[PDB]
Amino acid sequence: SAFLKNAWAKEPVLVVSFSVWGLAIIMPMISPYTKYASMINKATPYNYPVPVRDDGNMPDVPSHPQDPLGPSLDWLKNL
Amino acid sequence: IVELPTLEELKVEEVKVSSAVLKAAAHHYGAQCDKTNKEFMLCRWEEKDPRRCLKEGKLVNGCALNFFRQIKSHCAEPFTEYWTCLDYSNMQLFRHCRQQQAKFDQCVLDKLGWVRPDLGQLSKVTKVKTDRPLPENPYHSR
Amino acid sequence: RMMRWNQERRRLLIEDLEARIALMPLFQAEKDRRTLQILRENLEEEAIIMKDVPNWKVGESVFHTTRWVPPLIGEMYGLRTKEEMSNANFGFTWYT
Amino acid sequence: MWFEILPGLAIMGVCLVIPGVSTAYIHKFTNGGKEKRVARVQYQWYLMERDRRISGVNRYYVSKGLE
Amino acid sequence: MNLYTVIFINILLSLTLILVAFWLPQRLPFSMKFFLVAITFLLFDLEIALLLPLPWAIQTIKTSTMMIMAFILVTILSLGLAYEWTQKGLEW
Amino acid sequence: MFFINILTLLVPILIAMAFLTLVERKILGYMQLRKGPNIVGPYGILQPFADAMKLFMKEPMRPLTTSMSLFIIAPTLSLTLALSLWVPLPMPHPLINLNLGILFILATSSLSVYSILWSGWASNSKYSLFGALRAVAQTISYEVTMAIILLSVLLMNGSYSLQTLITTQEHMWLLLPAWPMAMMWFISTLAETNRAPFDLTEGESELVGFNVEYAAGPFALFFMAEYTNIILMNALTTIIFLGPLYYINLPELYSTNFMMEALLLSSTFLWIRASYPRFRYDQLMHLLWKNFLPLTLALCMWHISLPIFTAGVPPYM
């Protein structure tokens, strides 16, 4: 601890340097948003979404984009 | 040989409007005309051969054309203002023009009833059933 | 502020990618239609020049498969306008 | 007095705004009053090219609903 | 092409100057430290490379693996530095 | 028209180069209780043109022991790269916008280290070689942190294109966030232009190395190069970290503020020079490898983490 103190006052870059190294190694682990990154980027639609044939055996897939079925990004909205 | 289709076979009307115009109305075209669009697309993907799905494609242009004719009939002025402002920007970004966008979108909800699709709800995969038999042996595998 | 601004920007990134998603089907119908035209048009000229050729069918897939094959940009424009060819090859890189 | 240093700075400044205003109006002249399209990705070059074919030879000319 | 046009004007402007400039008028310095630096420099320069794609990799769906990877790279090189400090290296 | 634009970017910049020299000789003056050059022309405005003409007229000297190409290639390369790096800069519109723009600026800067290496070998005198070796080292070292500092920026910008930052900085300068690196970008910009606090490349009291055997026209070309760079790097600070307000309707207030911020930060390295003694050769590298590189590498990781857990991954494009 004592050295820590002097280190804070002598060679006070490394201290800050390491501190950041860690804080970046922690915040991701503990945060209410970390999960969003993999989603927000997942959602971003870059490649055309090819439509599947309607065997008529699928109640999950929305038959029309504006239908009340399917995925939503309201999480992205009001984020 | 190659059995490449003939020109008369592939001579159909198209929108032929500036990219911006399509872009300005894109959100509503993705809305009013995906039933046929998708179909053409589903034809396109499962039957890798475009030549096979050409017909669906003529339907595509057509559906859109009237989509435009209806716009031409109503809220046309709005649309004209929205596209002109949208075109000026180099990447034709949507946010520079929101005041013009609100008018046309509002109007089409008064005159055409069509609705601007909320953030998303166009990216989501669609189910369209098509008579064209699920091409068996696509890739013409031996 | 950076967190909020990029989240706004990301939503915008989604709003316009979907805009093309909607516009793509039309482009696909257009591209193919035009692509075939280029192949066929080249067929006309092909026949015109390959007729005299001794026992050389006008056109034949170097590949025996009957699957539909996209043509190389080189095939589409090689015998077309050289300028057209150039535009396709290095046009986007030089942009505008 | 320090104000004498200003004449020199002014000449530098005027000569650093010219470039930014110049490049940004020789673009809006050559491209028909519309910012030069930035084609970062092919899609954009495609749309741009498509525009060329749609009218004249130049993409800046832009046909509308009346076509 | 547009770039080519600009660049050749750029060389022309410089060659013009030097030409006028020449026409108008009418053994064993070695320290491993220096070599060592150059080396370190590339080890760091290579790493810069493995770190350059990070802007595209940010958008990768994984994210967890991205950061797990990137953090490991930065940490292992920094330890390389650490040992460079600990050793006489970086002490000229 | 494109040429017109080529001329509009190069000619003005070159003229600005010239007057920076004058401005450096008056702001340093008033700080040191002296008028500076005002007697030639009105208020010294004709002073930069005057020595340019004297420099080109004086006999270019080719040392008995000197390569004749690694000698003439070196100033041509220095001016060519520096004036070239102004090609892809957002003001706000770039002459040649490149999708990987910042990598162009980093790569083009890196190439200038050779000119120093080539000139030092070409001179064939001891002062030149010793100066070049230390110089190349300084420049290269200050490239490793220089590059990492940019990579941290990019990851919060989303792309390598300098044009994107005009849209990233529409609400706040990237100084507020990332100020810790600005400082470290500013100090690195001071090293890479061999300006004062870090002018050991060519120390005068130490080795009166880069231009020892360079006089007249060759002296001028690097010379011009350095000063143009002095501006360019300051301008990159004024786009990457201090984002000038951008209004799409009127593009020149972007360039007007770009003008103001660039001049002030260009004024700052002039002010730094008069204010500080020059650092020792090892004291200079001690800073980068010990003081800055650990700060930069760690803050580099913080800039890969800030995006993810703050769900702020920047939009590509």
UniProtKB/Swiss-Prot annotation, chain A:
Disordered: region residues: 54-79
Signal sequence interval, chain numbering: none
GO cellular component, one term: mitochondrion
Membrane topology: Single-pass membrane protein
Disulfide bonds: none
Keywords for this protein: Acetylation, Electron transport, Membrane, Mitochondrion, Mitochondrion inner membrane, Respiratory chain, Transmembrane, Transmembrane helix, Transport
GO biological process, one term: aerobic respiration
Domain of life: Eukaryota
InterPro entries, sorted: NDUFA3
Transmembrane annotation, as ranges: 14-34
Cellular location(s): Mitochondrion inner membrane
Biological role: Accessory subunit of the mitochondrial membrane respiratory chain NADH dehydrogenase (Complex I), that is believed not to be involved in catalysis. Complex I functions in the transfer of electrons from NADH to the respiratory chain. The immediate electron acceptor for the enzyme is believed to be ubiquinone.
Subunit structure: Complex I is composed of 45 different subunits.
Annotated family: Belongs to the complex I NDUFA3 subunit family.
Protein's recorded name: NADH dehydrogenase [ubiquinone] 1 alpha subcomplex subunit 3
Organism expressing this protein natively: Mus musculus (Mouse)
Curated annotation (Swiss-Prot), chain C:
Subcellular location: Mitochondrion inner membrane; Nucleus
Entry GO MF terms: ATP binding
Coarse class of the protein's main subcellular location: mitochondrion
Membrane topology of the entry: Single-pass membrane protein
UniProt keyword terms in alphabetical order: Acetylation, Apoptosis, Electron transport, Membrane, Mitochondrion, Mitochondrion inner membrane, Nucleus, Respiratory chain, Transmembrane, Transmembrane helix, Transport
GO cellular component: cytoplasm; mitochondrial inner membrane; mitochondrion; nucleoplasm; nucleus; respiratory chain complex; respiratory chain complex I
Superkingdom of the source species: Eukaryota
Biological process terms in GO annotation: aerobic respiration; cellular response to interferon-beta; cellular response to retinoic acid; extrinsic apoptotic signaling pathway; mitochondrial respiratory chain complex I assembly; negative regulation of DNA-templated transcription; positive regulation of execution phase of apoptosis; positive regulation of protein catabolic process
Keyword Mitochondrion: yes
Assembly: Complex I is composed of 45 different subunits. Interacts with CARD15, but not with CARD4. Interacts with STAT3, but not with STAT1, STAT2 and STAT5A. Interacts with OLFM4.
Similarity remark: Belongs to the complex I NDUFA13 subunit family.
Official protein name in the record: NADH dehydrogenase [ubiquinone] 1 alpha subcomplex subunit 13
Biological classification of the source: Eukaryota, Metazoa, Chordata, Craniata, Vertebrata
Gene: Ndufa13
From Swiss-Prot, chain D:
InterPro entries: NADH_Ub_cplx-1_asu_su-1 (IPR017384)
CC per GO annotation: mitochondrial inner membrane; mitochondrion; respiratory chain complex I
UniProt entry tagged with the keyword Mitochondrion: yes
GO biological process, one term: aerobic respiration
Subcellular location: Mitochondrion inner membrane
Residues annotated as transmembrane: 1-21
Pfam families xref list: MWFE
Highest rank taxon of the organism: Eukaryota
Topology class, membrane: Single-pass membrane protein
Keywords attached to this entry: Electron transport, Membrane, Mitochondrion, Mitochondrion inner membrane, Respiratory chain, Transmembrane, Transmembrane helix, Transport
Coiled-coil zones: none
Task of the protein: Accessory subunit of the mitochondrial membrane respiratory chain NADH dehydrogenase (Complex I), that is believed not to be involved in catalysis. Complex I functions in the transfer of electrons from NADH to the respiratory chain. The immediate electron acceptor for the enzyme is believed to be ubiquinone.
Self-association state and partner proteins as the record states: Complex I is composed of 45 different subunits.
Similarity field: Belongs to the complex I NDUFA1 subunit family.
Listed name of the protein: NADH dehydrogenase [ubiquinone] 1 alpha subcomplex subunit 1
Organism whose genome encodes this protein: Mus musculus
Swiss-Prot record, chain E:
Pfam families tied to this protein: Oxidored_q4 (PF00507)
Membrane topology, record value: Multi-pass membrane protein
Catalytic activity, as annotated: a ubiquinone + NADH + 5 H(+)(in) = a ubiquinol + NAD(+) + 4 H(+)(out)
Keywords: Electron transport, Membrane, Mitochondrion, Mitochondrion inner membrane, NAD, Respiratory chain, Translocase, Transmembrane, Transmembrane helix, Transport, Ubiquinone
Residue stretches spanning the membrane: 3-23, 34-54, 65-85
GO annotations of cellular component type: mitochondrial inner membrane; mitochondrion; respiratory chain complex I
InterPro entries to which the protein is assigned, alphabetical: NADH_UbQ/plastoQ_OxRdtase_su3, NDAH_ubi_oxred_su3_sf
EC number: 7.1.1.2
One MF annotation (Gene Ontology) recorded for this entry: NADH dehydrogenase (ubiquinone) activity
Enzyme class: translocase
Cellular compartments annotated: Mitochondrion inner membrane
UniProt GO BP: aerobic respiration; cellular response to glucocorticoid stimulus; mitochondrial electron transport, NADH to ubiquinone; proton motive force-driven mitochondrial ATP synthesis; response to light intensity; response to oxidative stress
Family: Belongs to the complex I subunit 3 family.
Role according to the record: Core subunit of the mitochondrial membrane respiratory chain NADH dehydrogenase (Complex I) which catalyzes electron transfer from NADH through the respiratory chain, using ubiquinone as an electron acceptor. Essential for the catalytic activity of complex I.
Subunit structure: Core subunit of respiratory chain NADH dehydrogenase (Complex I) which is composed of 45 different subunits. Interacts with TMEM186. Interacts with TMEM242.
Protein name (database record): NADH-ubiquinone oxidoreductase chain 3
